[PDB]
């Protein structure tokens with residue numbers, strides 16, 4: 001069912017995450033972590049304190065799809081587990097140094113063709129697929145986007161709800 005999902009998405013904030021390769025999204029799904037550039041890291045840390053749920057919606061560049069979405073479970077933290085990200089060009093391991101913990105809500109794909117009817121007021125009402133890494137997505141757009149994803153029956157939202 002979608003009732004627990006809607007409860008998780010209630011009053012959430014949504015951010016578009018653009019990854020330059022598939023390997024880091026695979027790593028994020030396996031290990032429950034994400035790292036981003038310092039400009040976006042500051043935005044997510046601020047949002048994490050401000051909202052019941054902060055939702056990251058992932059898209060690998062050139063894939064024409066979203067690869068799933070997840071909820072922040074912590075602010076960024078340094079040290080510890082040094083994630084072996086596959087670094088793109090012009091990207092250093094110190095730029096991706098802050099590590100957020102994330103709980104996946106959906107690890108299923110959604111093609112961009114399925115979200116063509118959703119526009120993002122915080123990006124000039126362009127289709128929600130369009131946006132830079134870290135672009136915030138307005139509440140109603142982000143909620144409907146997340147509801148378009150196929151259900152992920154491998155995930156039990158019960159423990160996610162407890163962390164709220």
Ligand SMILES: CNc1nc(Cl)nc2c(Cc3cccc(Cl)c3)[nH]nc12
Nearest residue numbers: 018019020021024035036088091133
């Ligand atoms: C684990 N974190 C990440 N992995 C990858 Cl492959 N790409 C990421 C981007 C997008 C981007 C924006 C500006 C410059 C560059 Cl080079 C890339 N943001 N976070 C990323």
